[PDB]
Amino acid sequence: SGFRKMAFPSGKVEGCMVQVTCGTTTLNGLWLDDVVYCPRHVICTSEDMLNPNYEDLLIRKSNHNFLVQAGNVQLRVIGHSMQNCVLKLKVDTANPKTPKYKFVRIQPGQTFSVLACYNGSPSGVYQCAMRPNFTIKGSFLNGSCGSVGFNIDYDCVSFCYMHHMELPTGVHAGTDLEGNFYGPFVDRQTAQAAGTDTTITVNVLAWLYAAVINGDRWFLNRFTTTLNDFNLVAMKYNYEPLTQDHVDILGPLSAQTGIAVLDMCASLKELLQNGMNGRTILGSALLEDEFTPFDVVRQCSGVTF
Amino acid sequence: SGFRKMAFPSGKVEGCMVQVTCGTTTLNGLWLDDVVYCPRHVINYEDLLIRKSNHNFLVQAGNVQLRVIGHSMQNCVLKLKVDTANPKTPKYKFVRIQPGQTFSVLACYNGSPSGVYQCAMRPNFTIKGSFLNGSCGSVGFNIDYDCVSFCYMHHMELPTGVHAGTDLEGNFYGPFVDRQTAQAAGTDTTITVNVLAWLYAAVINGDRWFLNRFTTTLNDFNLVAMKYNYEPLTQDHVDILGPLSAQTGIAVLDMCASLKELLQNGMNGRTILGSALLEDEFTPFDVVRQCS
Numbered sequence: 077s078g079f080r081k082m083a084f085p086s087g088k089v090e091g092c093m094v095q096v097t098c099g100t101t102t103l104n105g106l107w108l109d110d111v112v113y114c115p116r117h118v119i120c121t122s123e124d125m126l127n128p129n130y131e132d133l134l135i136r137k138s139n140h141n142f143l144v145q146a147g148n149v150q151l152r153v154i155g156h157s158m159q160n161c162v163l164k165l166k167v168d169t170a171n172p173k174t175p176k177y178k179f180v181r182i183q184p185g186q187t188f189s190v191l192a193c194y195n196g197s198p199s200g201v202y203q204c205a206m207r208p209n210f211t212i213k214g215s216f217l218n219g220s221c222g223s224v225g226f227n228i229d230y231d232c233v234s235f236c237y238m239h240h241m242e243l244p245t246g247v248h249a250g251t252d253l254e255g256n257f258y259g260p261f262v263d264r265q266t267a268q269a270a271g272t273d274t275t276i277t278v279n280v281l282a283w284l285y286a287a288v289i290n291g292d293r294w295f296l297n298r299f300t301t302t303l304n305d306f307n308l309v310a311m312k313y314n315y316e317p318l319t320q321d322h323v324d325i326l327g328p329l330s331a332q333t334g335i336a337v338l339d340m341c342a343s344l345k346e347l348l349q350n351g352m353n354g355r356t357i358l359g360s361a362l363l364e365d366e367f368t369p370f371d372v373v374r375q376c377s378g379v380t381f
Numbered sequence: 382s383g384f385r386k387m388a389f390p391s392g393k394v395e396g397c398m399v400q401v402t403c404g405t406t407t408l409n410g411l412w413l414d415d416v417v418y419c420p421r422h423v424i425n426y427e428d429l430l431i432r433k434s435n436h437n438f439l440v441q442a443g444n445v446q447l448r449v450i451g452h453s454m455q456n457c458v459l460k461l462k463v464d465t466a467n468p469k470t471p472k473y474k475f476v477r478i479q480p481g482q483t484f485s486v487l488a489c490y491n492g493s494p495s496g497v498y499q500c501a502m503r504p505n506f507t508i509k510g511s512f513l514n515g516s517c518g519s520v521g522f523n524i525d526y527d528c529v530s531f532c533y534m535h536h537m538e539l540p541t542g543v544h545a546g547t548d549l550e551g552n553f554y555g556p557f558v559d560r561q562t563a564q565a566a567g568t569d570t571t572i573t574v575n576v577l578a579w580l581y582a583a584v585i586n587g588d589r590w591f592l593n594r595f596t597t598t599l600n601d602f603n604l605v606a607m608k609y610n611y612e613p614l615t616q617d618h619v620d621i622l623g624p625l626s627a628q629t630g631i632a633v634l635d636m637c638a639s640l641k642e643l644l645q646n647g648m649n650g651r652t653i654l655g656s657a658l659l660e661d662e663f664t665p666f667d668v669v670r671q672c673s
């Protein structure tokens with residue numbers, strides 16, 4: 077019993093964190109096999125950030141300009157290449173702690189663990205979700221660039237995010253491990269703002285199924301809804317549209333608890349209309365949207381209370 | 382910017398998790414040097430233990446079987462002497478924590494870590510964790526510098542879904558016993574010094590709608606706080622909040638007057654750090670560490 081925001085054990089990622097220094101800038105890098113991955117803005121000054129020409133800044137650099145530190149050992153850089161907004165530093169030593177891994181690009185609504193680092197040293201781990209506006213509500217300070225997001229389903233680490241910047245609202249933007257940004261963001265200091273954010277509907281529904289699994293049914297009602305009528309109501313509360321794919325994905329939780337997806341949708345419509353009336357759901361007074369249908373199945377029991 | 386419930390990196394603890402099997406029971410053990418620590422309920426405990434031999438205990442570290450060469454009991458923890466020292470043993474200490482203190486939990490099943498979360502020792506000595514059958518033996522810890530301080534070992538779940546366990550020396554937190562009997566969590570209270578620390582964190586992150594021009598005495602605040610099932614705030618708590626008070630410019634009793642108004646009037650449709658409830662699972666030190 078219980079339902080916590082749970083992160084994956086970070087050990088497999090801790091053994092990959094390194095410190096990358098270029099001139100006066102110091103940030104984090106991910107050391108996998110003989111390559112160190114880090115944000116390409118490590119080669120920039122604060123002035124350069126307005127309109128940086130990365131190809132022009134990189135051509136002026138040599139291997140020995142990049143200092144890479146793994147614990148108390150200095151790694152030797154033997155090559156460098158750029159792939160989109162990521163810099164790949166070829167090093168002379170393969171990381172003996174390299175876990176089994178894959179680079180995966182995620183979609184909005186997906187969750188992942190973040191290992192926040194400073195100076196190549198891990199300081200904390202937390203769970204978060206890729207928002208519909210492609211930002212993440214993380215907890216990062218100056219020096220955290222290069223920190224990574226990941227999932228560890230089974231024994232394989234799937235790297236899905238690398239931290240690049242903080243937007244003016246305090247939210248964070250970054251790339252996949254191939255250097256492609258999530259969202260319409262660029263690694264440039266220019267007027268950039270996160271689009272209006274929305275609630276991840278399929279995740280709120282999954283969390284309502286988790287509450288039913290843990291023994292709570294106070295929010296259920298005798299009504300059902302059509303998918304279209306649900307979406308017309310949901311869009312008035314800034315909720316993401318619920319698609320047929322989302323309904324299909326909620327199938328297993330619907331079969332486990334005995335509550336059809338559109339009946340759970342009707343309970344959601346009512347909660348949006350009435351609020352909680354002094355009650356909580358899984359210790360929360362707000363509707364939680366940072367647990368996916370897959371997270372609920374992984375964390376909750378297979379036997380409904 | 383941002384404020385998340387953050388756990389310590391779990392790697393130093395992952396390298397200590399093992400699977401312990403005795404008969405039909407399978408739970409988790411903590412392998413430090415040549416000793417495996419696990420709940421004694423894996424087996425009148427002296428009478429049950431005397432009937433066991435070393436080979437009855439099966440210990441598995443990854444895909445390798447460890448050889449048990451000795452066994453002893455310390456309070457509600459069983460210590461299994463093994464033939465191999467854990468080469469991954471970190472620098473460590475066994476520490477007993479107080480209610481209100483927070484720690485990270487590495488939840489495990491079959492000696493395999495599955496998740497890490499942050500939680501607090503409630504004033505009623507229970508923890509609001511997330512555990513399933515097979516999680517027994519999972520541990521709670523903090524990291525201070527490069528040293529792991531082990532503070533909790535999971536033993537059981539109470540009928541309300543909350544959890545109970547011991548320190549690493551086998552002494553229970555709370556008036557609980559390790560057996561199937563009628564046990565219940567006492568009435569819980571809110572950790573006041575932690576709510577205040579979380580209000581300072583909100584001010585640091587630019588959330589100031591709850592600030593007011595008022596102050597209060599420590600006694601008047603405590604008369605108010607006890608009415609809402611909040612733990613009493615002591616002069617030690619006020620002293621501990623000193624650095625956050627100097628950083629934000631809001632005196633502790635000034636922040637108490639904000640807390641008094643939040644308890645009597647509610648939040649009025651507003652949130653604080655994305656929460657509609659007053660959060661009490663961040664200590665003053667957690668706030669300073671996450672905001673530095």
Ligand SMILES: O=C(Cc1cccc(Cl)c1)Nn1nnc2ccccc21
Nearest residue numbers: 216217218240241242263264265382
């Ligand atoms: O934002 C930057 C530098 C930067 C500026 C402009 C563009 C780019 Cl790609 C990078 N660093 N970061 N990242 N997270 C932070 C949290 C707080 C303070 C600074 C932080």
Ligand SMILES: [Cl-]
Nearest residue numbers: 181182183186
């Ligand atoms: Cl995805």
